[PDB]
Amino acid sequence: MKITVVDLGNINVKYVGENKGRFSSKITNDYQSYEEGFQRVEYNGIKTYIGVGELSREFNKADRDYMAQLLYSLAKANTADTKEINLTLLLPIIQMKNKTRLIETLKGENFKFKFNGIDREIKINDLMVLPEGYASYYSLDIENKKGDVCILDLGSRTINICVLENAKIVKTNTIKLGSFDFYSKIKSLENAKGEDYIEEDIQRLIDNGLIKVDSKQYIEFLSDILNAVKPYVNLKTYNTIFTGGTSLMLKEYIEKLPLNKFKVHPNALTSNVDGAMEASKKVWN
Amino acid sequence: MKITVVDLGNINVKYVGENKGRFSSKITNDYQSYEEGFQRVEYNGIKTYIGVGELSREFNKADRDYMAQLLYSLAKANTADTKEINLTLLLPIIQMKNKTRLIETLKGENFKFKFNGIDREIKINDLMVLPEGYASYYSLDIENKKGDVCILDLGSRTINICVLENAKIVKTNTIKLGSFDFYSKIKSLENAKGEDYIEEDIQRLIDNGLIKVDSKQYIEFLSDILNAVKPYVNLKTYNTIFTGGTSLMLKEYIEKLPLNKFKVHPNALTSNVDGAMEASKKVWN
Amino acid sequence: MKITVVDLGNINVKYVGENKGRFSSKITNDYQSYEEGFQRVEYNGIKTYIGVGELSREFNKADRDYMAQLLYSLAKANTADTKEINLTLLLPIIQMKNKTRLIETLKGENFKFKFNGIDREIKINDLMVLPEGYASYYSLDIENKKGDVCILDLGSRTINICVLENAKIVKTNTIKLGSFDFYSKIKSLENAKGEDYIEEDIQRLIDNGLIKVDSKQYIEFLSDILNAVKPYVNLKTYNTIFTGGTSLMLKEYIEKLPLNKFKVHPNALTSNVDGAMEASKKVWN
Amino acid sequence: MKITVVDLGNINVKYVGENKGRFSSKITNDYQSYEEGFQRVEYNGIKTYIGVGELSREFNKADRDYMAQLLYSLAKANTADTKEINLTLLLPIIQMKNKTRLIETLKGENFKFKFNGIDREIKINDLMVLPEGYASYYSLDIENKKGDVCILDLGSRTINICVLENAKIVKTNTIKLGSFDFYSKIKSLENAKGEDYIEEDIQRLIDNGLIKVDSKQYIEFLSDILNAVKPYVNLKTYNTIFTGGTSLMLKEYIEKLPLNKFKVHPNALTSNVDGAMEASKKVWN
Amino acid sequence: MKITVVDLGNINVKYVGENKGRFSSKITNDYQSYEEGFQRVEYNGIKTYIGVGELSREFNKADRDYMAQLLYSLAKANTADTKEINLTLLLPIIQMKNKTRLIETLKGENFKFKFNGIDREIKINDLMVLPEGYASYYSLDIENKKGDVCILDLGSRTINICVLENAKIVKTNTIKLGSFDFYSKIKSLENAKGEDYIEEDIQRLIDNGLIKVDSKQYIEFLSDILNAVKPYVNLKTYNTIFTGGTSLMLKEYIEKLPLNKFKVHPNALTSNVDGAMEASKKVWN
Ligand SMILES: Nc1nc2c(ncn2[C@@H]2O[C@H](COP(=O)(O)OP(=O)(O)O)[C@@H](O)[C@H]2O)c(=O)[nH]1
Ligand SMILES: Nc1nc2c(ncn2[C@@H]2O[C@H](COP(=O)(O)OP(=O)(O)O)[C@@H](O)[C@H]2O)c(=O)[nH]1
Ligand SMILES: Nc1nc2c(ncn2[C@@H]2O[C@H](COP(=O)(O)OP(=O)(O)O)[C@@H](O)[C@H]2O)c(=O)[nH]1
Ligand SMILES: Nc1nc2c(ncn2[C@@H]2O[C@H](COP(=O)(O)OP(=O)(O)O)[C@@H](O)[C@H]2O)c(=O)[nH]1
Ligand SMILES: Nc1nc2c(ncn2[C@@H]2O[C@H](COP(=O)(O)OP(=O)(O)O)[C@@H](O)[C@H]2O)c(=O)[nH]1
Ligand SMILES: [Mg+2]
Ligand SMILES: [Mg+2]
Ligand SMILES: [Mg+2]
Ligand SMILES: [Mg+2]
Ligand SMILES: [Mg+2]
Q: Please, are residues E27 and E56 in contact by the beta-carbon 8 Å criterion?
A: yes
Same domain, E37 and E80: yes
The Cα A259–Cα D132 span in angstroms is 61
Helix C179-193 / helix C215-226 crossing angle, nearest 10 deg: 140
Long-range contacts of E20-25 (CB under 8 A, 24+ apart): E20/E77, E20/E270, E20/E273, E21/E76, E21/E77, E22/E269, E22/E270, E23/E50, E23/E51, E23/E72, E23/E73, E23/E76, E24/E50, E24/E51, E24/E52, E25/E55, E25/E56, E25/E69
Question: CB-based contacts of E81: which residues, under 8 Å, 6+ apart?
Answer: none
**Please, which residues bridge with residue D172 across strands?**
D162
| Amino acid symbol at B111 | F
Same domain, C118 and C152: no
Q: At C208, phi and psi to the nearest 5? A: -90, 0
Q: Indicate the top mutation candidate among C6, C12, C180, C252 to test ligand 3's pocket, ranked by most ligand atoms within 8 A of CB.
A: C12
Cβ(C133) – ligand 3 distance below 6 Å? no
Alpha helices in A26-178 (DSSP H): 68-77, 99-106, 134-138, 142-145
Q: Please, are residues B46 and B192 in contact by the beta-carbon 8 Å criterion?
A: no
Half-sphere CA count of A284, side-chain side, radius 13 A: 17
Same domain, D217 and D125: no
User: What burial class does residue E252 get, using C-beta atoms within 10 Å of its C-beta: 0-12 exposed, 13-18 middle, 19+ buried?
Assistant: exposed
The Cα C179–Cα C245 span in angstroms is 9
Alpha helices in chain A (DSSP H): 68-77, 99-106, 134-138, 142-145, 179-193, 203-208, 215-226, 245-248, 251-254, 268-284
Chain E environment of A55 (Cβ under 8 Å): 227
Same domain, E157 and E72: no
* Helix%, strand%, coil% for chain C, nearest 5: 30, 30, 40
Task: List C-alpha distances in Å: B223 to B103, B228, B249, B254, B263.
Answer: 38, 9, 14, 10, 17
Smallest CA–CA distance, residue D5 to chain C, in Å, is: 26
Q: For chain B, what is the radius of gyration of the CA atoms?
A: 19
Task: List C-alpha distances in Å: A17 to A4, A42, A87, A88, B144.
Answer: 4, 22, 9, 10, 66
Give the pairing of strands C239-243 and C149-154. Answer: parallel
The Cα E285–Cα E49 span in angstroms is 35
Q: How many domains does chain E have?
A: 2
For residue A143, what is the DSSP state?
H
Across chain C, the runs of DSSP E, i.e. the strands, are 2-7, 12-16, 21-24, 27-28, 39-43, 46-50, 84-91, 110-113, 120-131, 149-154, 158-165, 168-176, 239-243
CB atoms within 10 A of CB E18: 12
| Interchain contact, D188 vs B95, CB within 8 Å | no
Counting DSSP H helices and E strands in chain C, the numbers are: 10, 13
Half-sphere CA count of B74, side-chain side, radius 13 A: 30
> Please, which experimental method was used?
cryo-EM
Q: At A231, phi and psi to the nearest 5? A: -60, -30
The Cα B218–Cα B200 span in angstroms is 18
The Cα C87–Cα C126 span in angstroms is 7
Q: Breaks in chain C, named by the residue before each, with C–N above 2.5 Å?
A: none
For residue D49, what is the DSSP state?
E
| Amino acid symbol at E226 | L
The Cα C284–Cα A166 span in angstroms is 57
Half-sphere CA count of E141, side-chain side, radius 13 A: 10
Q: Please, are residues A50 and A40 in contact by the beta-carbon 8 Å criterion?
A: yes
| Interchain contact, B59 vs D194, CB within 8 Å | yes
Question: CB-based contacts of E146: which residues, under 8 Å, 6+ apart?
Answer: E166
Same domain, E198 and E154: yes
Task: List C-alpha distances in Å: B56 to B11, B52, B66, B67, C228.
Answer: 9, 12, 10, 12, 8
Same domain, A165 and A261: yes
Q: Is C207 helix (H, G, I), strand (E, B) or coil?
A: helix
Which atom of ligand 3 is nearest to C251's Cα?
A: 1
Same domain, A235 and A278: no
Q: Please, are residues B55 and B10 in contact by the beta-carbon 8 Å criterion?
A: yes
Classify D256 in phi/psi space as left (phi over 0), alpha (psi -120 to 50) or beta.
alpha
| Amino acid symbol at D110 | N
Residue of E120, E247, E246 whose CA lies nearest to E183: E246
Same domain, B57 and B140: no
Q: Please, are residues B37 and A169 in contact by the beta-carbon 8 Å criterion?
A: yes
Cβ(D17) – ligand 4 distance below 6 Å? no
**Chains B and E, touching by 3 or more CB pairs within 8 angstroms:** no
Resolution (A): 3.5
Same domain, B240 and B152: yes
CA D66, D68, D71, D73 torsion-angle sign: negative
Smallest CA–CA distance, residue B208 to chain A, in Å, is: 9
Q: Please, are residues D103 and D128 in contact by the beta-carbon 8 Å criterion?
A: no
| Amino acid symbol at B56 | S
Same domain, C139 and C250: yes
DSSP string, D131-161: ETTHHHHHTS-HHHHSS-EEEEEE-SSEEEE
The Cα E66–Cα E49 span in angstroms is 14
Residue of B155, B122, B121, B114 whose CA lies nearest to B136: B155
Buried residues in A9-18 as b, exposed as e (16+ CB within 10 A): bbbbbbbbbe
The Cα D85–Cα D87 span in angstroms is 7
Task: List C-alpha distances in Å: E137 to E154, E161, E169, E171.
Answer: 14, 11, 11, 14
| Interchain contact, D34 vs C95, CB within 8 Å | no
Residue of D110, D111, D74 whose CA lies nearest to D89: D74
Q: Please, are residues E130 and E117 in contact by the beta-carbon 8 Å criterion?
A: no
The Cα C43–Cα C51 span in angstroms is 17
Same domain, E101 and E200: no
Same domain, D121 and D25: yes
Task: List C-alpha distances in Å: D50 to C169, D13, D115, E266.
Answer: 12, 11, 11, 74
For residue C251, what is the DSSP state?
H
Half-sphere CA count of C39, side-chain side, radius 13 A: 19
The Cα B103–Cα B120 span in angstroms is 22
Domain containing E228 equals 134-273
| Interchain contact, C93 vs D196, CB within 8 Å | no
Q: Please, are residues C66 and C2 in contact by the beta-carbon 8 Å criterion?
A: no
Contact pairs from chain A to chain E, CB under 8 Å: 44
Task: List C-alpha distances in Å: B206 to A151, B52, B191, B214, E91.
Answer: 22, 18, 14, 11, 61
| Amino acid symbol at D210 | L
The Cα A160–Cα A153 span in angstroms is 5
Helix D179-193 / helix D215-226 crossing angle, nearest 10 deg: 140
Q: What is the arrangement of strands in the sheet containing C21-24, beginning at the earlier edge strand?
A: C21-24, C12-16, C2-7, C84-91, C120-131, C110-113, C39-43, C46-50, C27-28
Q: Please, are residues E26 and E55 in contact by the beta-carbon 8 Å criterion?
A: yes
**CA end-to-end span of chain D:** 9
| Interchain contact, C56 vs A94, CB within 8 Å | no
Across E132-260, the runs of DSSP E, i.e. the strands, are 149-154, 158-165, 168-176, 239-243
**Please, which residues bridge with residue E123 across strands?**
E84, E110
CATH of the domain at D115: 3.30.420.40
Chain A environment of C56 (Cβ under 8 Å): 227
User: What burial class does residue A1 get, using C-beta atoms within 10 Å of its C-beta: 0-12 exposed, 13-18 middle, 19+ buried?
Assistant: exposed
